[PDB]
Write a protein that binds this ligand. Structure first.
Ligand SMILES: CCCCCCCCCCCCCCCC
Ligand SMILES: *[C@@H]1O[C@H](CO)[C@@H](O)[C@H](O)[C@H]1NC(C)=O
Ligand SMILES: *[C@@H]1O[C@H](CO)[C@@H](O)[C@H](O)[C@H]1NC(C)=O
Ligand SMILES: *[C@@H]1O[C@H](CO)[C@@H](O)[C@H](O)[C@H]1NC(C)=O
Ligand SMILES: *[C@@H]1O[C@H](CO)[C@@H](O)[C@H](O)[C@H]1NC(C)=O
Ligand SMILES: *[C@@H]1O[C@H](CO)[C@@H](O)[C@H](O)[C@H]1NC(C)=O
Lengths: 797, 92, 58
């Protein structure tokens, strides 16, 4: 009676016009979104290709000057002959931009004006023209970066660098992805008595700073030999170097101690055995062993002749520490195999040495002329210029000095570096318009490794690992770890990775938007691969989201009264009115001052994406009609503290105009928990307020109710809006009294308990009130539970 | 890595009853679901253990030593440029 | 000042030094291509240094 569900249904029905219930095909939509994202990535790939060719061409003709005192090189250092820039405070990046000269970022420990940096700056000064050409032939392109292999970083939109600047382009994920092919490392940390002391600390730090340089598609393990080749971890084979396994390996390395007698033969035999463990799903290429040792005197010739006969493996060796032992065997080991020998005197040399093996690993791909010029996208990762979540494209640029002269006797087998472009996930999130879907639907895409990309539960902050401690890693959520995991969904994940395109339907569980409920529901999936790249876009529609209410309007008078309907001055007679933040053609987004956004909307509509505005105004009109017809008439029913209605678009109306002052729900209805849940279920749903909140509630707000207004417009189930009442707690407590009686809901939240002490603590999860009763209640086949994991959350300890 | 939890109805049955055996004692409960509504009504006896906390709390993820035994399906790239004969091994 | 730059030309600009050897907590410091306190650049300087050695201090 209070909300008046049938009243809203009749209001919708009587206006059979003003509607066009188009069906979300759920396959054509997926295909078109896939094509659009592929087109975007193709634009970026084209920009990368042209930049790479230009860089190669310009480098080819440099002449290697060596006297830069005269004809000084002019550039703009980021950490500010330097240039004096003028910055346009463009809103695309959220910081300062210039658009007329490419900044530079020389890492702190590199000298500004050496004989190598200066040459890099000169010969890259030609890249500015092509940068401008790229950014001009199509705007909305965020960053073009050039991580040359000398520490530089020439990114075109010149902004001041974002305190000790530790950035070093040769270590970023988007550089390693380009500089080398995947790897199968095996770090032979030398924990023998000869390294105890400082050298052990250097070994542990170096191993950590090396594991920092492994992507998610290249495996790793950490052996250690002291006359016995144990494993510092619990793995015993290669483990994919996720963001998590890296944690275990780092902890194991940190908790290591020297002992025993050095024995290279046994350690290397064990290592080469571990690289022949083909039945553990290894990455079959770049079989690498990277021995960490102080110094040795026994070159294990026998083992290198038994195994690695065909030079399959690539043995690198570091003579870490400041010592005086023989470095002959180590150099010979690095030389005989297709390896390379380093030296780590002390901290400070770790960062610039552990990353150098990529230069060696790039030799085969350089020797393969253009078979490697393939744009290779990375996995999501927070920007380095506080921009958000961006995936990067990479395209290595080779060194052609003597090409077409055919000298082929030079250092022509090394890459200049990697030149990459960044795509904001906020720019893929507008090629997948979620608004036409119901609040339950959404898109998502996955790497071939399964890690998500463009997923609603992908919050922008680093993925956490392990419990915190008392005192840059990519954001990689596995698609099963972003949603509830059951038997069926794993099949869908497996079928997306292979690229098989298909459709599936079933009944499953969906975690509520506030992480306090679970609901059964049907979710007609959909998945196709984007032929351009290695991704498989998906789309999850419930069974009632197939059709959406599009709005068509031409009178200019009906939309007129709809437009002045929701004016802030009409709240007293039309109730409060939020508006969700939705990107109109050019309207500025919300600054969480919903009133100011509403005023801006008023001005824009007074002046004059059109469907979105059309349909939000349609919802405004219908909600006004409902409230004025019924809510205004039967004002202040006995047990109704506040009457509220939520629709799509963002028209949230709360009648009293005072409860709106106590309306904690987000204006974006697609993010309101009760809306999605109320849509999912088929009965009134009660959402107990949280307990011990800073703000008020549960006595001056009243518990909430909701019931989606199902519609039969022409024989199709639609659920546009949701209506409910914040039932006053006191009157309903009286009603309860007139009948230890406890009223409870799924999620174990006390809506009531006759005992007066309990009802004071209304809304707490029952279970910290009388545990044993629930503990047994779970036992009798009611109140099951699912104990999932959240990988993005904040803890104080 | 917190650890969320949720509780929800399993069976379609509406009436539930039994006895609670906290310790050397008995209690009476009768559970009834308000039909056409997401609510359950129960009547426990007067008061006379270990708290359930549905609120998420910090913890560690799955024991990685376990999931590595049966790692999730994964299809890596298949280019991996390496093993080229025309390579100069004269660096060291 | 840095131990990994063995020439005057490649010893310039700031660099990173870690407090008490802790891998975290870097400190930025300049590079200086300084000689030893006592040097054998000249016969006079050599006599000076070798006199300090004759005192068993330094
Ligand atoms: C007599 C033995 C010591 C000689 C030291 C000569 C002085 C060093 C050069 C600086 C003079 C101003
Ligand atoms: C690239 O972007 C432009 C501008 O948005 C667009 O017109 C074009 O269709 C996109 N596709 C290409 C050419 O890759
Ligand atoms: C390098 O500087 C010289 C002198 O200004 C100039 O003639 C030449 O074109 C420059 N080349 C590059 C790499 O920009
Ligand atoms: C270190 O590893 C050893 C293995 O014997 C184990 O006993 C110990 O608990 C570990 N300690 C830490 C700090 O993890
Ligand atoms: C490219 O290699 C040539 C010799 O093959 C070398 O002279 C030049 O310095 C290299 N280019 C760069 C970017 O250093
Ligand atoms: C959730 O709990 C139900 C009932 O115990 C169980 O059938 C299901 O496998 C669980 N699902 C997850 C994702 O844990």
């Amino acid at each position: 009676t209070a909300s008046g569900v049938n009243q809203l249904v009749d209001i919708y029905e009587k206006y059979q016009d003003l509607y066009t219930v188009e069906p979300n095909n759920a396959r054509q939509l997926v295909e078109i979104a896939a094509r659009d994202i592929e087109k975007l990535l193709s634009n970026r790939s084209k920009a990368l290709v042209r930049l790479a060719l230009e860089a190669e061409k310009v480098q080819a003709a440099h002449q290697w000057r060596e006297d830069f005192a005269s004809n000084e090189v002019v550039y703009y250092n980021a950490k500010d002959q330097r240039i004096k820039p003028v910055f346009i405070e463009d809103a695309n990046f959220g910081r300062q931009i210039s658009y007329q000269h490419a900044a530079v970022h020389i890492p702190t420990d590199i000298y500004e004006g050496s004989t190598i940096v200066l040459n890099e700056l000169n010969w890259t000064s030609a890249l500015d023209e092509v940068f401008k050409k790229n950014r001009e032939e199509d705007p909305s392109l965020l960053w073009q970066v050039f991580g040359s292999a000398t520490g530089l970083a020439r990114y075109y939109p010149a902004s001041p660098w974002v305190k000790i600047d530790l950035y070093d382009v040769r270590r970023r994920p988007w550089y390693i992805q380009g500089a080398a092919s995947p790897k199968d490392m095996l770090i032979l940390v030398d924990v023998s008595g000869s390294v105890s002391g400082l050298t052990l600390k250097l070994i542990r730090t170096s191993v950590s700073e090396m594991l920092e340089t492994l992507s998610d598609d290249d495996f790793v393990n950490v052996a250690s030999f002291n006359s016995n080749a144990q494993d510092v971890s619990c793995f015993q084979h290669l483990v994919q170097a996720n963001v998590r396994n890296k944690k275990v390996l780092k902890d194991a390395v940190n908790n290591i101690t020297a002992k025993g007698i050095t024995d290279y033969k046994k350690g290397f035999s064990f290592a080469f055995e571990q690289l022949l463990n083909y039945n553990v799903s290894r990455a079959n290429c770049n079989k690498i062993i990277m021995l960490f040792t102080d110094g040795g005197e026994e070159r294990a010739q026998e083992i290198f002749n038994k195994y690695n006969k065909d030079k399959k493996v690539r043995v690198f060796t570091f003579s870490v520490g400041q010592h005086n032992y023989d470095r002959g065997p180590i150099q010979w080991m690095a030389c005989e195999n297709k390896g390379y020998y380093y030296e780590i005197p002390s901290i400070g040399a770790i960062r610039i040495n552990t990353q150098e093996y990529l230069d060696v690993l790039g030799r085969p791909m350089v020797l393969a002329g253009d078979k490697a010029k393939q744009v290779q996208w990375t996995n999501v990762y927070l920007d380095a210029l506080e921009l958000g979540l961006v995936i990067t494209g990479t395209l290595p640029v080779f060194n052609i000095t003597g090409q077409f002269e055919n000298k082929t006797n030079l250092k022509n087998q090394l890459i200049l570096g990697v030149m990459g472009v960044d795509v904001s996930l906020e720019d893929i999130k507008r090629l997948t318009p979620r608004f036409t879907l119901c609040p339950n639907g959404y898109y998502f895409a996955i790497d071939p490794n399964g890690y998500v990309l463009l997923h609603p539960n992908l919050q922008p902050k680093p993925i956490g690992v392990g419990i915190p401690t008392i005192n840059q890693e990519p954001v990689t959520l596995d698609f099963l770890d972003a949603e509830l995991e059951n038997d069926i969904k794993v099949e869908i994940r497996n079928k997306m990775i292979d690229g098989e395109s298909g459709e599936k339907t079933f009944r499953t569980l969906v975690k509520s938007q506030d992480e306090r409920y679970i609901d059964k529901g049907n979710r007609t999936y959909t998945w196709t691969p984007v032929n351009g790249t290695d991704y498989s876009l998906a789309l999850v529609l419930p069974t009632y989201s197939f059709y959406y209410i599009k709005a068509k309007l031409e009178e200019t008078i009906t939309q007129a009264r709809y437009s002045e309907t929701l004016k802030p001055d009409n709240f007293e007679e039309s109730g409060y009115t939020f508006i969700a933040p939705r990107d109109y053609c050019n309207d500025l987004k919300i600054s969480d001052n919903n009133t100011e956004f509403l005023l801006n909307f008023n001005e824009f509509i007074d002046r004059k994406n059109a469907d979105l505005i059309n349909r939000v105004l349609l919802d405004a009109g219908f909600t006004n009609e409902l409230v004025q017809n019924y809510w205004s008439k039967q004002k202040n029913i006995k047990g109704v503290k506040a009457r509220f209605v939520v629709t799509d678009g963002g028209i949230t109306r709360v009648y009293p105009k005072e409860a709106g002052e106590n309306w904690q729900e987000n204006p974006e209805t697609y993010e309101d928990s009760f809306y999605k849940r109320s849509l999912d279920n088929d009965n009134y749903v009660f959402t107990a307020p949280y307990f011990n909140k800073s703000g008020p509630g549960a006595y001056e707000s009243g518990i909430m109710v909701s019931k989606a207004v199902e519609i039969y417009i022409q024989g199709k189930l639609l659920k546009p809006a949701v209506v409910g009442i914040k039932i006053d707690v006191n009157s309903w407590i009286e009603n309860f009294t007139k009948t230890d009686c406890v009223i409870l809901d799924d999620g174990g939240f006390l809506l009531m308990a006759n005992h007066d002490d309990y009802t004071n603590q209304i809304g707490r999860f029952f279970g910290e009130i009388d545990p044993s009763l629930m503990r047994h209640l779970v036992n009798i086949s009611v109140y099951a539970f699912n104990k999932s994991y959240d990988y993005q959350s904040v803890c104080e300890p | 890595i917190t650890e969320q939890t949720q509780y929800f109805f399993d069976n379609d049955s509406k009436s539930f009853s039994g006895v609670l055996d906290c310790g050397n004692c008995s209690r009476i409960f009768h559970g009834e679901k308000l039909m056409n509504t997401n609510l359950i009504f129960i009547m426990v006896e007067s008061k006379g253990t270990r708290l359930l906390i549905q609120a998420e709390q910090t913890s560690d993820g799955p024991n990685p030593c376990d999931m590595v035994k049966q790692p999730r399906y994964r299809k890596g790239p298949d280019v991996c440029f390496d093993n080229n004969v025309l390579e100069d091994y004269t660096d060291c | 000042s840095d131990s990994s730059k063995q020439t005057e030309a490649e010893c310039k600009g700031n660099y990173i030094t870690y407090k008490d050897g802790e891998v975290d907590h870097p400190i930025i410091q300049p590079r200086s291509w300084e000689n030893s306190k006592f040097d054998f650049d000249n016969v006079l300087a050599a006599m000076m240094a070798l006199f300090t050695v004759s005192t068993f201090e330094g």
